């Protein structure tokens, strides 16, 4: 066994080992191992991405105009965000400026994604860590009605409704086919909701499962389909025609009316169902405002997103702030430059890749993706792993760092960055949220806080959706219809050699695509994705990533039942296909 100190933690792999493989209720493939001491406290945490596809390799030699479609398939949960980053990157390389409506529609696609993805995460992915679904069978329907009506104006709250929901659940389990609820952690002492709150949450799980399908109709209008809508280098292919022959063949007033209807419904569902449920989980699980802090009180990172001034990715344009905090100095939000070789670097000394020197980090324009499956001295064999060896290579995920620092990305990170830059709307939302729970502001730096921030952000994005839609309509009223720039569509117009960066804030955090074009083809295409940051393995100094740090020092009630591990991991909304690509 070994012990060492990093980032204020004591990493100690003596003592009992626990393995959780698969992690469920995530996108894709993850394995987690911990060591726990006699006091059932985690003293070591190991984050392992258990899948790899090699998009960075597949993209070589492709036409840059096609790249978005390949990289979109990095992930069908955060569907669209890689296409956005791709078109941004290729535009940045070639020197293309898109017309305003294309930028606005891209922003609509991103906000839509934030709304949908956050909603599904809350209910379908994280929800069952907080809601005891079987306990809902013990609730009183009237008391459930009274609880819901005390929290929200949402219409669907009658005692009869809760009775019908409860009876559906009762019938479902009566046959002994518990499906997705089978062998769950029900009754675990960390489930703290009363029965009425469980029934309310379960009802809302079902309502959210239904409703989420509507949100993506916005993607279908502008992007053809969801999952995996379509895009173009130069703007968007969804040509607009409001008042001319053949509008039936384009984005017309009827199509725009459909979009508006979905926006209003989306805001309503988020504000009246998800937001009160997030606060209710907070009210019953206040101790989780002090669990899973990890790097969130030390190092957090946002690139920023939603350029409101078309083709301007600077601080005056991005509606979602960018910046970095290190060393817990939230008074120094530092500027991020994705071209600076000294900022974003990836290490692979603890990952299954080959570098010329695995003791140094490589900026993505110098990135290398040369897969090397070498788990070294595992307990077991190459093809039957009982325990990874975290002293050597243990993941398909590369280890990104920012100026050498290990960073947390995602909703909490963004909220912190915007809060400390003095964004009025963020400051008010955070202050009011934590006031409502009678918690200190520091309580957002936590597993509970990650969930609260995500719910916040769904509300923020639903508001921005309307803002962007109104901007589009303003342009149309002014006769500004353009959706594409095509003067540099043809490869012969491109520089023989050029490179670009496309960046945004995906639902899970900071996303970058670095692309080099040479001789009309993709010469290099390197992705660093939010879950790459959060689920990162160690670096040459032994510094731990966000998941490892958040899991450190966690109490477990029952070692064999990883409820606390799942709560913290799920709070980051892991996307493993994203992390590995």
């Amino acid at each position: 066994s070994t012990q060492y100190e990093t980032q204020g933690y004591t990493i100690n792999n003596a003592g009992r080992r626990l393995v959780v493989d698969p992690i469920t209720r995530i996108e894709g493939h993850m394995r987690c191992e911990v060591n726990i001491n006699d006091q059932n406290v985690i003293t070591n945490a190991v984050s392992c991405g258990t899948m790899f596809r090699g998009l960075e390799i597949i993209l070589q030699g492709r036409d840059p105009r096609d790249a978005w479609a390949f990289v979109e398939r990095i992930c069908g949960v955060c569907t669209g965000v890689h296409a956005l980053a791709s078109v941004y990157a290729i535009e940045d390389a070639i020197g293309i400026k898109v017309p305003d409506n294309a930028n606005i529609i891209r922003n609509i696609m991103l906000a839509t994604l934030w709304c949908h993805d956050h909603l599904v995460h809350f209910y379908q992915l994280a929800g069952m860590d907080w809601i005891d679904v079987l306990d809902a069978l013990k609730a009183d329907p009237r008391k459930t009605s009274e609880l819901a009506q005390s929290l929200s104006s949402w219409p669907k709250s009658s005692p009869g409704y809760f009775f019908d929901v409860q009876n559906r659940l009762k019938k479902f389990v009566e046959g002994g086919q518990l499906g997705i609820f089978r062998n769950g952690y029900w009754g675990h002492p960390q489930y703290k909701l009363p029965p009425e709150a469980n029934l309310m949450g379960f009802a809302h799980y079902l309502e959210a499962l239904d409703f989420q399908r509507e949100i993506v109709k916005i993607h279908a209008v502008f992007g053809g389909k969801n999952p995996h809508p379509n895009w173009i280098v130069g703007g968007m292919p969804c040509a607009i025609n409001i008042d001319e022959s053949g509008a039936v063949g384009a984005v017309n007033m009827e199509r725009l009316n459909l979009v508006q209807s979905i926006i209003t419904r989306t805001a309503d569902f988020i504000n009246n169902v998800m937001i009160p449920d997030a606060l209710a989980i907070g009210q019953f699980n206040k101790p989780w405002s002090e669990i899973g802090t990890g790097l969130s009180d030390k190092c957090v990172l946002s690139y920023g997103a939603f350029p409101d001034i078309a083709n301007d990715f600077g601080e005056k344009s991005l509606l979602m702030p960018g910046g970095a905090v290190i060393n817990g100095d939230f008074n120094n939000v530092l500027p991020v430059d994705l071209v600076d070789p000294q900022q974003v670097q990836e290490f692979v000394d603890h990952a299954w890749y080959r570098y010329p020197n695995d003791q140094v980090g490589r900026h993505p324009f110098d990135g290398i993706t040369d897969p090397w499956y070498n788990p070294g001295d595992v307990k077991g064999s190459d093809t039957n792993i009982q325990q990874l060896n975290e002293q050597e290579r243990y993941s398909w995920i590369k280890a990104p760092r920012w100026r050498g620092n290990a960073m947390e990305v995602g909703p909490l990170a963004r909220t912190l960055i915007a809060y400390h830059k003095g964004d009025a709307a963020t400051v008010e939302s955070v202050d009011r949220m934590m006031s409502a729970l009678n918690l200190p502001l520091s309580g957002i730096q936590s597993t509970l806080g990650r969930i609260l921030c995500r719910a916040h952000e769904a509300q923020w994005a639903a508001g921005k959706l309307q803002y962007f839609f109104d901007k589009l309509m303003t342009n149309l009223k002014n006769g500004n219809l353009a959706t594409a720039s095509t003067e540099k569509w043809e490869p012969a117009t491109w520089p023989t050699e050029c490179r670009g960066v496309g960046f945004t804030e995906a639902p899970r955090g900071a996303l970058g695509h670095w692309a080099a074009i040479r001789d009309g083809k993709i010469d290099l295409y390197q992705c660093v994705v939010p879950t790459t940051w959060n689920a990162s393995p160690r670096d040459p100094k032994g510094q731990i990533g966000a998941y490892e740090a958040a899991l450190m020092n966690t109490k477990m009630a029952i070692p064999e039942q990883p409820l606390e591990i799942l709560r913290t991991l799920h709070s980051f909304d892991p996307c493993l296909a994203c992390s590995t690509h």
């Binding site: 596809r53 398939r73 569907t79 993506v216």
Partner: protein
């Protein structure tokens, strides 16, 4: 009265196929899960994790041996002894073979399970391989597309439950009901194709009138799917309607049939 057991496993994937499934408008995915099937194993949605999840996996395939449907999302990599996709510390391909052995039938969701999809595009770093090249002794119903249409996925399930049989298939194992005809044979822009009325550059006047996307690279003429009839997301749109040519995403090897913008 009990519902048909379904085990849903995940190889190398992006999870687009799961996501499409939950979009289903009619029946709602909620109602599929609660009333039509028994979704007995699915890493993306299930409460249990780790050892609790694998106990469910083993119990289901044992107790319902020969009686469950295996749904497969994603595909197995053969490279690095299978450990490009690790499941409970072992190659995914071993979990796939075990699950397949007990199934009455297999649904290969999506271009991934059917053909290979993006990870199998050149140079296929992981040796990602479609299910039917690994499992050669079981009925496999291919439901291709990246992903397939939500209401196609659910209609195929409702067919199985209502009629107590597999859908009849073409020579490639795709359900005839949804894959019997080409995109281009049910395309509402076909009048323009026939007239030589084509978009030639993005957002030109032709594009603003909904003219045909053939000269922009549309692969509808060689692609079999229901997008131009059933359409996407509760009948709201499809790729061509929103101004992008078909990529050919339901067809084997579509990623390497040249640029999406070329003939």
């Amino acid at each position: 009265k009990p519902r048909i057991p379904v085990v849903w496993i995940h190889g190398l994937e992006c999870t687009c196929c799961t996501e499409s499934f939950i979009r289903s408008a009619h029946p709602l995915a909620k109602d599929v899960i609660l009333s039509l099937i028994s979704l007995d194993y699915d890493d993306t949605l299930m409460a249990a994790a780790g050892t609790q999840a694998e106990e469910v996996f083993e119990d289901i395939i044992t107790q319902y041996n020969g009686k469950y449907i295996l749904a497969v999302e994603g595909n197995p990599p053969l490279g690095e002894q299978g450990m490009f996709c690790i499941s409970s510390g072992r190659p995914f391909i071993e979990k796939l073979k075990r699950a397949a052995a007990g199934a009455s039938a297999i649904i290969a969701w999506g271009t991934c399970a059917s053909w290979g999809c993006v990870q199998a595009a050149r140079p296929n770093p992981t040796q990602a391989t479609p299910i039917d090249k690994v499992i050669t002794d079981k009925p496999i119903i291919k439901v291709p597309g990246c992903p397939p249409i939500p209401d196609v996925m659910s209609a195929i399930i409702t067919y199985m439950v209502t009629f107590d049989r597999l859908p009849d298939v073409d020579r490639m194992g795709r359900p005839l009901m949804f894959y019997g005809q080409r995109i281009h044979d049910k395309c509402y822009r076909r009048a323009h194709f026939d007239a030589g009325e084509f978009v030639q550059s993005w957002d030109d006047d032709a594009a603003r009138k909904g003219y045909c996307l053939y000269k922009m690279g549309c692969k509808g003429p060689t692609t079999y799917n229901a997008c131009s009839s059933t359409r996407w997301n509760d009948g709201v749109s499809f790729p061509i309607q929103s101004g992008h040519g078909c990529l050919g995403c339901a067809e084997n090897g579509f990623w390497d049939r040249g640029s999406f913008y070329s003939r």
